[PDB]
C-alpha cells in the first residue's frame, strides 16, 4: 500500500458518497468547504492546486457547478467523470434557468443508487488495481441507501396528501418532492443572482395563505431571512434549515449523505407535526 488514490470532488455530498465507495484504498476531498454556496462558487489558485494533484475528479453536472468547466480547463491529465449519467432530470420551471435540468438529483434516495454506480464505474476504470474493493464497498453502501427509502417514505406518508406542500427558499427539493408526493413552492428556482426579491416572496405568501400551508424552510448554504419574512407575514411557522447543497462539518449534525437525507426528512416531518 504505497500512496492512496486521490479523488477530488466539486462539493461535499459527492465527497461523502465517493468516500464510502473508496473505503480504505482512496482519499476523497471536496473543493468546496461545508457550508459554502456551491452553484456560483469562485475557484481559487488553491483549488486548482488540489484538483491538479488528484488522480480523479468527480462532479455533478446537470448545471450544478457553473464554475466547473472553466476551472477544469486549467487541469492537465487528470481524468474526470460526471456522476449523474443515467438520471432522468426534472426541468427548472421558471426564471432565467427555466427548462434546463434541476441539478439537485441526489435528494432522491433512488437517484443516489445511480450516483453510487457512476462513482463505482469511474473508480474501477481509473484505479483498476482496487476494482474489487470499490465493487464490494459500493455493493454494501447501495444496500444501506436502498434500505434508507422505506422508513423515509412511510414517515412522510403520514402527512395527508393534499397538505403535502414543501415550501423552501431554493427550489432544491424537486426530486425529493416527486419521490414522496409533495407539491413544490419556493422563493427562487435555483441559486443565482435574484434570491428573495419581491414578486417571488409575494407569490409564495399567496400560495401559503390560500392553502394554509403550516411551515416554510430555508437551507444551510443560503440566507434564512426570506423564509423568516414569509413566516412572519403568514400563518406558517419557520421550519428551520434543510440540508441539500452541503453537509455540515464532520463534527456537525449532518456529517454524511445518509445523515443529510435523514435530517432533511425529519425536519420536514417535524414541521408538519410528524
Q: Which C-beta is closer to Fe ion: that of 191 or that of 256?
A: 191
Shortest Å, Cβ 103 to Fe ion? 7
- Residues in touch with Fe ion (CB under 5 A): 170, 172, 191, 245
Segment (H or E) for 121: helix 109-126
Shortest Å, Cβ 236 to Fe ion? 22
- Cβ atoms of 180 and 152 within 8 Å: the answer is yes
The cell numbers describing 28, all together, are 476523497
Q: Which C-beta is closer to Fe ion: that of 47 or that of 245?
A: 245
132 in a labelled binding site: no
- Distance between CA 16 and CA 22 in Å, rounded? 10
245 in a labelled binding site: yes
Shortest Å, Cβ 100 to Fe ion? 13
- Distance between CA 124 and CA 47 in Å, rounded? 25
Q: Which C-beta is closer to Fe ion: that of 109 or that of 214?
A: 109
Shortest Å, Cβ 101 to Fe ion? 13
Q: Which C-beta is closer to Fe ion: that of 244 or that of 258?
A: 244
The cell numbers describing 184, all together, are 413544490
125 in a labelled binding site: no
104 in a labelled binding site: yes
Specify binding-site residues for Fe(2+). 39, 104, 170, 245
Amino acid at each position: 500500500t504505497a500512496k492512496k488514490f486521490k479523488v477530488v470532488t466539486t462539493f461535499t455530498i459527492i465527497q461523502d458518497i465517493a468516500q464510502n465507495i473508496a473505503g480504505d484504498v482512496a482519499v476523497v476531498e471536496s473543493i468546496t468547504k461545508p457550508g459554502a454556496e456551491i452553484h456560483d462558487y469562485q475557484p481559487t489558485p488553491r483549488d486548482i492546486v488540489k484538483a491538479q494533484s488528484a488522480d480523479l475528479i468527480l462532479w455533478n453536472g446537470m448545471n450544478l457547478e457553473r464554475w466547473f468547466e472553466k476551472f477544469f480547463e486549467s487541469i492537465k491529465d487528470v481524468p474526470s467523470a460526471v456522476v449523474t449519467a443515467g438520471i432522468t432530470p426534472l426541468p427548472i420551471r421558471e426564471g432565467p434557468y427555466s427548462g434546463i435540468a434541476n441539478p439537485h438529483a441526489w435528494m432522491s434516495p433512488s437517484n443516489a443508487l445511480i450516483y453510487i454506480e457512476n462513482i463505482r464505474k469511474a473508480l474501477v476504470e481509473h484505479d483498476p488495481a482496487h476494482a474489487e474493493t470499490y465493487n464490494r464497498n459500493a455493493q454494501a453502501y447501495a444496500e444501506k441507501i436502498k434500505a434508507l427509502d422505506a422508513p423515509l417514505r412511510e414517515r412522510l406518508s403520514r402527512i395527508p396528501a393534499e397538505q403535502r406542500w414543501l415550501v423552501t427558499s431554493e427550489g432544491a427539493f424537486s426530486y425529493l418532492a416527486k419521490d414522496y408526493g409533495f407539491k413544490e413552492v419556493y422563493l427562487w428556482p435555483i441559486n443565482a443572482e435574484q434570491q428573495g426579491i419581491p414578486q417571488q416572496v409575494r407569490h409564495v405568501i399567496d400560495i401559503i395563505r390560500e392553502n394554509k400551508i403550516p411551515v416554510v424552510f430555508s437551507e444551510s448554504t443560503i440566507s434564512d431571512k426570506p423564509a423568516k419574512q414569509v413566516s412572519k407575514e403568514t400563518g406558517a411557522q419557520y421550519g428551520g434549515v434543510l440540508y441539500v447543497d452541503s453537509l455540515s462539518g464532520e463534527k456537525g449534525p449532518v456529517p454524511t449523505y445518509i445523515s443529510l437525507i435523514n435530517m432533511t426528512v425529519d425536519t420536514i416531518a417535524k414541521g408538519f407535526g410528524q
